[PDB]
Design a protein around this ligand. Sequence first.
Ligand SMILES: Nc1ncnc2c1ncn2[C@@H]1O[C@H](COP(=O)(O)OP(=O)(O)OP(=O)(O)O)[C@@H](O)[C@H]1O
Ligand SMILES: Nc1ncnc2c1ncn2[C@@H]1O[C@H](COP(=O)(O)OP(=O)(O)O)[C@@H](O)[C@H]1O
Ligand SMILES: [Mg+2]
Ligand SMILES: [Mg+2]
Lengths: 232, 240, 50, 240, 238, 70, 146
Amino acid sequence: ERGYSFSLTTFSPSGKLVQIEYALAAVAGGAPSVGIKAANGVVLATEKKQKSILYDERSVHKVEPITKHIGLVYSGMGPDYRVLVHRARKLAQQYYLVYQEPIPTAQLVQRVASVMQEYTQSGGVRPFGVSLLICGWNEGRPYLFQSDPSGAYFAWKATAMGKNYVNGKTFLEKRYNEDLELEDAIHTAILTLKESFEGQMTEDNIEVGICNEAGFRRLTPTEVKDYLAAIA
Amino acid sequence: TGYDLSASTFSPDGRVFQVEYAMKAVENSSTAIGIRCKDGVVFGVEKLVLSKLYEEGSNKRLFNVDRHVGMAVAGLLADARSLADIAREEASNFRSNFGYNIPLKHLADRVAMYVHAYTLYSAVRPFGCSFMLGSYSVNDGAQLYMIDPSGVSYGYWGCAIGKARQAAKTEIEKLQMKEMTCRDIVKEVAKIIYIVHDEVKDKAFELELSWVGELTNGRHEIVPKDIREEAEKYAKESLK
Amino acid sequence: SQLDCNFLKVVSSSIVDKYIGESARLIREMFNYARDHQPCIIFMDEIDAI
Amino acid sequence: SSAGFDRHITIFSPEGRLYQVEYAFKAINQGGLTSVAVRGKDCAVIVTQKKVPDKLLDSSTVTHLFKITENIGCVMTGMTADSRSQVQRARYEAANWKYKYGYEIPVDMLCKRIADISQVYTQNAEMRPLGCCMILIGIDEEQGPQVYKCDPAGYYCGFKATAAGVKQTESTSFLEKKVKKKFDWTFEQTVETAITCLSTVLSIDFKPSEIEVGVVTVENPKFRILTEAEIDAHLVALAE
Amino acid sequence: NQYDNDVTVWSPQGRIHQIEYAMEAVKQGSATVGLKSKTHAVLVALKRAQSELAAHQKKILHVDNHIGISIAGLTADARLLCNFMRQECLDSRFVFDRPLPVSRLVSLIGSKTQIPTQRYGRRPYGVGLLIAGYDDMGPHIFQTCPSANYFDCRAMSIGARSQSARTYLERHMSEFMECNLNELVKHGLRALRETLPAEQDLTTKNVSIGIVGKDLEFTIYDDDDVSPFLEGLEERPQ
Amino acid sequence: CGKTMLAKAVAHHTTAAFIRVVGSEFVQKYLGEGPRMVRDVFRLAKENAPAIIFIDEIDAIATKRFDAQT
Amino acid sequence: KGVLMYGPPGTGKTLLARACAAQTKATFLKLAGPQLVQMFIGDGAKLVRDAFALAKEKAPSIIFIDELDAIGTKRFDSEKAGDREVQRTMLELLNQLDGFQPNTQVKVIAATNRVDILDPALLRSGRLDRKIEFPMPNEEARARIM
Ligand SMILES: Nc1ncnc2c1ncn2[C@@H]1O[C@H](COP(=O)(O)OP(=O)(O)OP(=O)(O)O)[C@@H](O)[C@H]1O
Ligand SMILES: Nc1ncnc2c1ncn2[C@@H]1O[C@H](COP(=O)(O)OP(=O)(O)O)[C@@H](O)[C@H]1O
Ligand SMILES: [Mg+2]
Ligand SMILES: [Mg+2]
């Protein structure tokens, strides 16, 4: 068949793109997630509750790696996330086949956010309903970036996305400083996800991934139980 | 309203009306029945004589797809012979690529996916035709399928499509198609479509029958004149 | 068909009329009749009117 | 809660919802059907009912169980025309895995490719997003049996017990009380606890002519469909 | 009526209104009558004009040496199917070196005109083709319609005020399969005087006759050679 | 949420007079009954005691919209 | 008990009802649709039970309701607004026809030309039993009509 070839996103007479403003409403109703960088690595932590006891929690993953040293979480709707993961998996390869080098984390966000802007102007498509948090340690210094469905991006020290994100940002502002280790940032990322979870925060209700200079990796539920123990 | 203009929109209770509106157009075409016997399939179509000016043998609602596969249609006749062209063309690609005659479980699968493909987009409409496919093979026996405008197909021991659908298939299950050969079936096919369509609605009508099986040596063709005259001899004994 | 004296079926449309307080006087004076006949069942068919 | 054409095509509501997808979830419920899948310690069982309302219909052509690959079977709910089209894709995607990569596709990678295709329908404002569901079973090496569901929104997850259809919530409430007491599960107990799921939700207590059961086990990894005779063996043992 | 806009949209009753409106276009053009014997196929048309000094619009066209057609509707879509008609006849003559049979020609038209009756933003062809020709089976009279539904017939009439012509053809079609070319034509000419007001009938400049015949190539007769056929008719009874 | 319940417990441990009215009985049939029915509640709350007035379902009385035609 | 005729608006529905008024010598009683709508509350409800009590008195009697979609419009849930007083006259017409204390003395003939508007509570099986439709005249009936 064919497409529509006309933009269904227009300017309001008040000068606001209304469909992007509605896509941020779907982002705010997602699962809460926080991200903190502190002086040797970045901590990405999310909140994953299955609806019932029938679900296999070891089947899907919120925290995904992009390369050896770049991880990526979200807070939005599910099926839109897996599309731009597989897009960003590919974009890290065409950088590598040209330059023979792992991609900088800044240049990935240059190209992932260019996809999302291109997708909110072209013909016959609704914009994405996810916001991202991207970590990585390129040339020693770590990085923590946040995109949005409009296609912009920022450079955060610590931020929260999802439900009650305006309460997490007040909580992180009274908590974060310049000087923390990675294991301290893990402890304050669980302390800010406890603001909005249910009563039981077990080893499988959350999912944590870290970066070092050793590279991105994702925590197994063994040591996640040890971090969840002696917390709060 | 507004939820029923395109075929790309669901309703607020979750169904597509453009397919349901095209299903309603089938019950203004008249009646096509087809049952399979023990060793073959017999079609049957009663044909309305609209005026005297048309010629006996016009505008046949009973096609011939392949050498062994037959089609009896019911619906908007322009879409009937358009679906008959792709089914006639689909069997030609099977023999050219795979060497042998197409089976019915594959043929009705390829056609129904072609019919289903127009129930998805706003650029095209659903077809306004329902039709039957029947054949006979020496390695598979008799087969009988039927396709709605949505794209759903099933097997049947006997089916009916047209105006009076339930009023036709009520008397089909009075028969015993498991054991009868395709000779006495021909008299019983005609009889159940004389009791339908009272003479108040139509003045006069035309019988048209079809026929396949190993008695026809696998090839699909029309009945001879003398056999359908025996069924038309077996017409006016339903007044008792 | 079990009580016959202290069973109250109500159509839930006879209880409304165009006067000022006569619609709510019945609901007072049905349940005042209900306490006076202590084993009793109130039945209220088609309450969507009221 | 609505502004623009958000009731008609797949764009965002002012509340962040989008209604054409959640209209399509209750297009599954119009089939009048309910299927149950249960994962065991060394096996995987799909059970579902079949409702044949006619004697004139061939009862061997109404199977909602489909064989995708040699070791992968599935059950289909929702409307029939969209479900059979989605089986045709899954047969095609598994063959391209073997041709490109040289080994048998894992059952979670196949469910990912189906959910990625279904994502695009709710991603363009032109297509109708295929109102039917998807449940797969299969044996994986160093994983054992595993069960997956794919919905018409593009979501998927691995389950341990699965219900889909009209009586989905009543069946899952029955199964979650069954699994959390954590009895060990043999082969026949998973067959017993799956039949007694939809026998107590639907309250039927049937004979073996109305249901159909596919199974896979790590001694015979071929997806196989049970004969009605051996269905009756499990059924009379269920009535102690 | 929001169900009355595009060809794609079905009615809730199940009748696509854009097809039914193209039937109104063929009812606007002037009448024409075709009929056949055992060995001949004759179609007779009735022209119209705008002023008395403008010429009359012709309707009978020559497709091939054994096939001729007659149009009714808008003339621009008539030439669009006519140039498709001529092209499909001479390439079959180019490939197989044989006259293309008539019953196999019309099924190409029915597949041609069905395509724009299903797409989006595509009108139907408003046209009224009556086709007369020769197979190896003798004469054939075919009519079409913008619903892409062609009809096999033995005598038909289409155009403005054509129901009165059909009633004449029904009560005389027992005589048609016997007569020669002479009173086969003036059987059809008595149908065109039926479909007129009661004062003007056949003044030798608004009528045309085309015959294909068993040893006769398709021939169009115009406004002088009509006069041998046109003489020998009785006066209108009143 | 214990709206009617908490009023029951206050009336049980009070030492004051408790005056308990339902707020849909001021709509009597005869005109002028209601305004007489309002003002003798508080007069009874005056003469009797340092008392407590409890009015329930004020929505039967205090609304927003009116219509001076009926 | 209870017949319903429907279809396109010019097929002849009143014409059967005016025919039956001339044939049987019973107590014929006719109604307009919007006649059972009153400004004050409960008067359209009172007007229904007065009519069926009158046809209760003349014990051979049949009752006719024309344009039933005036009052029998489908119920709906909404806040802030919406008519309610029309449903009360409908919900007694459900009950005073059929339900508690039924009778076999009066017969209802109802006629509308649109069906999808109507409440399914009045199309159950017991309230309006035989739902016949009136198709447009095919060919031969038009030769008989004119
Ligand atoms: N400690 C408690 N807190 C809240 N509710 C209670 C408690 N104990 C009992 N209840 C229940 O709450 C019910 C409601 O009491 P009450 O009528 O005071 O609530 P309410 O807010 O007035 O509701 P409504 O306004 O609808 O009457 C009681 O019938 C009782 O069964
Ligand atoms: N034989 C007939 N069949 C159908 N309609 C007829 C016949 N004879 C007369 N009529 C016309 O049908 C009309 C009946 O109106 P009707 O269709 O009942 O209105 P409505 O259905 O909108 O109440 C009369 O005006 C009458 O002139
Ligand atoms: Mg209370
Ligand atoms: Mg009327």
